[PDB]
Design a protein around this ligand. Structure first.
Ligand SMILES: *[C@@H]1O[C@H](CO)[C@@H](O)[C@H](O)[C@H]1NC(C)=O
Ligand SMILES: *[C@@H]1O[C@H](CO)[C@@H](O)[C@H](O)[C@H]1NC(C)=O
Ligand SMILES: *[C@@H]1O[C@H](CO)[C@@H](O)[C@H](O)[C@H]1NC(C)=O
Ligand SMILES: *[C@@H]1O[C@H](CO)[C@@H](O)[C@H](O)[C@H]1NC(C)=O
Ligand SMILES: *[C@@H]1O[C@H](CO)[C@@H](O)[C@H](O)[C@H]1NC(C)=O
Ligand SMILES: *[C@@H]1O[C@H](CO)[C@@H](O)[C@H](O)[C@H]1NC(C)=O
Ligand SMILES: [Ca+2]
Ligand SMILES: [Ca+2]
Lengths: 66, 416, 416
C-alpha cells in the first residue's frame, strides 16, 4: 500500500501548518512451495517418420490428480 | 546538497516533495451568505430528538462571515473556520468550487471536511488544459444512475482506469458535522501497483485545476410544510477544509517547482531536460529519445558530440535503430571542413597531413594540382599526389619526366 | 581558501587561531561591593610614607559599580575597569572566580592584572568535565606548605608533569596596583619541547572551565588596632584583566570552532573525522585507527572501500596487524552476492561469467544442476560444469551419454 504521512506541531491554542510525505510499503515475502521429484527413465522410441512414443517412470508413485 | 546527484555524482530520479496544492489558494465559489445578510440554522441530533440553533451570516463582520478564503486557510480543530453557501440551493440548483493550480500536478487525493452534513450528491472534476474543458474525476451519490448517469458501486475496470467512478460511500447524513470525503485517485485501479510503468494512470492523476460541484443536499422532508422559512434556512453547504494532495508533475526530472520571469509555476528541470513538466529535452541533447524517469533507471537526456564543430544537432530515428537503441544524434551543418555525425573528415582538392591528427584545425592541406599538368583536381589523400598526365614526375604535376619536353597541346603537356 | 587543504589539495594539520577564551564571557564570583553599598580605601606608597584615599562602591551607579563583567570586558590602559570583592574577606574566608568555556581548550596561559595588591595566597583550578570535579593547575603562596599543602619552589618532575606546582613568585605586595600573575601551562615541564608527541602534556593543557581562588590577602597588621573600620576597609581583591589564552582542542583536524544546532561550541572537523574535539572518526572511515595530527604527518582518517556493495564497514585489529599497519577496514553485510573485505566474490550453486568483470552486478550466473542427473549442486566456477554422475555429457547434467539409456534408479540415472 501507498501511505501519505502528515506531521503537525501542536500546542494549547491549536495545531500548526502540516508537512506532508508519501511512501509505498515493501511487499510481504511469500515462501516458494518445495518442488517435486522429476520423472525418471525417459526413453524415446521411434515408430515412423512423423511419430515417436515417449515412456517415463515415477519413483514417487507407490488417487492423486497429478 | 542536490537530490538529483548521487554520492559519486551520477544522475538519479528527482521527485518534488508531497504538498497540499490547495493550501492558501483562492477558490471561486458560486454562493456565499452575507450579501444580503441572511439567517441560517444549525441542526444537532442527540438520542431520538433533533435540536436547532439559528445564527446570522454577515459578510462585513469578520466573526460572522464565511468567505471562500475559509476553505484554503489553516485548519485548526480548536478554532474551525468554514465557508457557507446561500440557504436552500437544492437540486436542480448547484454550488460549485473551482480551484486553479496553474500547473500540471500528479494528484494523489482530493479531500473535503464538512461543517454542515455531507451532500446527497457531489462530484469532483479536473482540467487537463488550464480550465477550458472539464473531465470528471469521481462521483458521490445515493442514486448514481438517476443523478450522475454512472453505475452505482461500479468496480474499477482494467480496460478503462481513466474513467470516473460513482459510489454511495461517504454520502451518509451521519455525521451531521465533521463529515469527511477523501478521494484516492489510484484507489481500486488494477495497474496502480506498477504506476511508474503505466502512462494511462500517470495521465489520470494529472490535473491543472480541480472543480467540486455539490448537486443535491440531504433533507428530512420538512421544507414543504406550513412554515417554509424555518426549515429551508437549516439546509446549506459548508466546508472547513479542502485538501488537494499530490506532487508537482516533473516526469522524475525535478526536485522543486519555481515561479519563472512571467510569475508562472514551472519545474526546475534537471538531467539535461527543459519544459514546464520536463516533457521535452534541452537543445543539443537529442542523442536519445525523451523518456520519463523510473526508480531503477535515471533516464537522463544524453548530450550530442560534434567535436566543437557544430552548434545544432538533430535526432535520427533510423540511425538510433541502426545503432541498436544506443545513440541517434546527428550534428547539423558541420563547420571547419568536416563531415559525419562524428563531424571529423577531409575533402577533395585537398589531402590529409599525417603529422597532425584528424581532430586538429590544419588536418587537411591544400592540393595544388597544376591546371595544365594534372588531369583532375582531386588527389591522393595519404601521400598528396595529383593525377598526372603523360607520366609527369611532379608531386603537384608541375615538371615533365626524363627525356620529355614541354608541349603547346593541352591534351599532351609533355612529349618524348 | 581552506587551511586544511595543501597547494595541490593534499591533507595537512589544522589548528584553530590563538584566542583569549575568557574575553566577553560571564564569570561567577563569590563577592561584589555595592549590595549593600559600602566604603573602600585605596592605599598608595610614596617614599617612606603610606597614603589612603577612601571611595564608595555603589552597585546601582555605573561609574561607582565594580561588577564581574569588568574582568572580561576590553582592557584599556587609559580607562581601566576592575571588579572588586567585599571588604575584608581574609583567610579562612575566600573569594573565587569560576569561568566556563563550555568546550575543551588547549590552555597556554591564565593571566590576572590586579587593581588592588596581589594576594598572599592564590590558586588556579581546571575542570576536565564541564564543572563536576576540579583538578589544581597552579598555586601561588608565601607558605606553600602551610597554605596549599605543596612544596615551596618545587622543580618540575619528568615523572609527573600533570601535577600543579606551588611557588612564592609573583606574590610580592609591590606593585600595590597593576600587579600581574601570568601562569604558563608548559613552563618548566621537561617534555614540553616534544609536545606534539607527548599525550601527558596534551592532557595537562586541556580544560573546559577555569576557577581562580583568592585565599589569603596581603596585610600590614593594622586591622587588629583600636580603629578596625578604617583599616579593614582598605583590604580587598580587585582584578582589571583576566586572560585565558589558548587554542580550541581539535586534535589537529579543525581550523575553527563553530556553534551547532543546540548552541554548543564544537570543532568544524576535517580529514574525514567527527566528534566535539575530533577525537573519533566519521562513519565508513574506519580503515585506520584514530591518531592525533602532527606537523610532519597529516594523520587523516582513511575511507573504507566496499565497491558500492556495503553501507557499513568495521575496523579489525588482527587484519590491520596482518597487513603490517597499512589497512584494517572490513566491510559489513556485503550485498549483491559478494564476499571478502574487498566485497567482490562468487558463491556456490553459482559460477562466474567470463564476459563481464567481478565488479559487475551479473558477475555470477546461476548453476542449474539437474536434481537427478548431477551428484552435487556446487559446480565448476570458470567453465560452468555440474558434477555429473555415470559419465553424463550434459553441461548441467541433463542428457545421458552415448549408448546409455535413462534408468528408474536414483543412484544410476544412465545405464549402458
Ligand atoms: C451586519 O449586518 C447589517 C445588515 O444591515 C449591517 O448593517 C452591519 O454593518 C453588519 N455588521 C458589521 C459589523 O458590519
Ligand atoms: C477563529 O475562528 C473564527 C470563526 O469566525 C475566525 O473569525 C477567526 O479568524 C479564527 N482565528 C484563527 C486564528 O484562525
Ligand atoms: C451546475 O449548474 C450549472 C449552471 O449553474 C451547470 O452548467 C452544470 O452543468 C451543473 N452541474 C454540475 C455538475 O456542475
Ligand atoms: C547610591 O547608594 C545609595 C544607597 O542608599 C542609593 O540609594 C543610590 O540609589 C545609589 N546611587 C545610584 C545612582 O543609584
Ligand atoms: C571607563 O571606566 C569607568 C570606570 O567606572 C566605566 O564606568 C566606563 O564604562 C569605562 N568606559 C569604557 C568605554 O570602557
Ligand atoms: C574556599 O571556600 C569554600 C567555601 O566557601 C571551600 O569549599 C573551598 O575549599 C575554599 N578553598 C578553595 C581553594 O577554594
Ligand atoms: Ca478552515
Ligand atoms: Ca577591564
Amino acid at each position: 500500500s501507498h501511505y501519505v504521512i502528515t506531521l503537525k506541531a501542536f500546542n494549547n491554542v491549536g495545531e500548526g501548518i502540516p508537512l506532508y510525505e508519501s511512501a509505498v510499503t515493501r511487499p510481504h515475502t511469500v515462501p516458494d512451495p518445495t518442488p517435486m521429484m522429476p520423472p525418471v527413465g525417459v526413453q524415446a522410441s521411434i515408430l515412423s517418420h512423423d511419430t515417436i512414443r515417449i515412456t517415463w517412470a515415477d519413483n514417487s508413485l507407490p488417487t492423486d490428480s497429478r | 546538497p542536490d537530490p538529483c546527484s548521487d554520492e559519486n555524482g551520477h544522475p538519479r530520479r528527482c521527485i518534488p516533495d508531497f504538498v497540499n496544492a490547495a493550501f492558501g489558494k483562492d477558490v471561486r465559489v458560486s454562493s456565499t451568505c452575507g450579501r444580503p445578510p441572511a439567517r441560517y440554522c444549525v441542526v444537532s441530533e442527540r438520542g431520538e430528538e433533533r435540536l436547532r440553533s439559528c445564527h446570522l451570516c454577515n459578510a462585513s463582520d469578520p466573526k460572522k462571515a464565511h468567505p471562500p478564503a475559509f476553505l484554503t486557510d489553516l485548519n485548526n480543530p480548536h478554532n474551525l473556520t468554514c465557508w457557507q453557501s446561500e440557504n436552500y440551493l437544492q437540486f436542480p440548483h448547484n454550488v460549485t468550487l473551482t480551484l486553479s493550480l496553474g500547473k500540471k500536478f500528479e494528484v494523489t487525493y482530493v479531500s473535503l471536511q464538512f461543517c454542515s452534513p455531507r451532500p446527497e450528491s457531489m462530484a469532483i472534476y479536473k482540467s487537463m488544459d488550464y480550465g477550458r474543458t472539464w473531465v470528471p474525476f469521481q462521483f458521490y451519490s445515493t442514486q448514481c444512475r438517476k443523478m450522475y448517469n454512472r453505475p452505482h458501486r461500479a468496480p474499477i475496470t482494467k480496460q478503462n482506469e481513466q474513467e470516473a467512478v460513482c459510489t454511495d460511500s461517504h454520502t451518509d447524513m451521519r455525521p451531521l458535522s465533521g463529515g469527511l470525503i477523501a478521494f484516492s485517485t489510484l484507489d481500486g485501479r488494477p495497474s496502480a501497483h506498477d504506476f511508474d510503468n503505466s502512462p494511462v494512470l500517470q495521465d489520470w492523476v494529472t490535473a491543472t485545476d480541480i472543480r467540486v460541484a455539490f448537486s443535491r443536499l440531504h433533507t428530512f422532508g420538512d421544507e414543504n410544510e406550513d412554515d417554509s422559512e424555518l426549515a429551508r434556512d437549516s439546509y446549506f453547504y459548508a466546508v472547513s477544509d479542502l485538501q488537494v494532495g499530490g506532487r508537482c508533475k516533473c516526469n522524475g526530472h525535478a526536485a522543486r517547482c519555481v515561479r519563472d520571469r512571467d510569475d508562472s509555476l514551472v519545474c526546475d528541470c534537471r538531467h539535461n531536460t527543459a519544459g514546464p513538466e520536463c516533457d521535452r529535452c534541452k537543445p543539443f541533447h537529442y542523442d536519445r529519445p525523451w523518456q520519463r524517469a523510473t526508480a531503477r533507471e535515471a533516464n537522463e537526456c544524453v548530450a550530442c558530440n560534434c567535436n566543437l564543430h557544430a552548434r545544432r544537432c538533430r535526432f535520427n530515428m533510423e540511425l538510433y535503430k541502426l545503432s541498436g537503441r544506443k545513440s541517434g544524434g546527428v550534428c547539423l551543418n558541420c563547420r571547419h571542413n568536416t563531415a559525419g555525425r562524428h563531424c571529423h573528415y577531409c575533402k577533395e582538392g585537398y589531402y590529409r597531413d599525417m603529422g597532425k591528427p584528424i581532430t586538429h584545425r590544419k588536418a587537411c592541406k591544400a592540393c595544388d594540382c597544376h591546371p595544365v599538368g594534372a588531369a583532375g583536381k582531386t588527389c591522393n589523400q595519404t601521400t598528396g599526389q595529383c593525377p598526372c598526365k603523360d607520366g609527369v614526375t611532379g608531386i603537384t604535376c608541375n615538371r615533365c619526366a626524363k627525356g620529355y619536353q614541354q608541349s603547346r597541346s593541352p591534351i599532351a603537356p609533355c612529349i618524348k
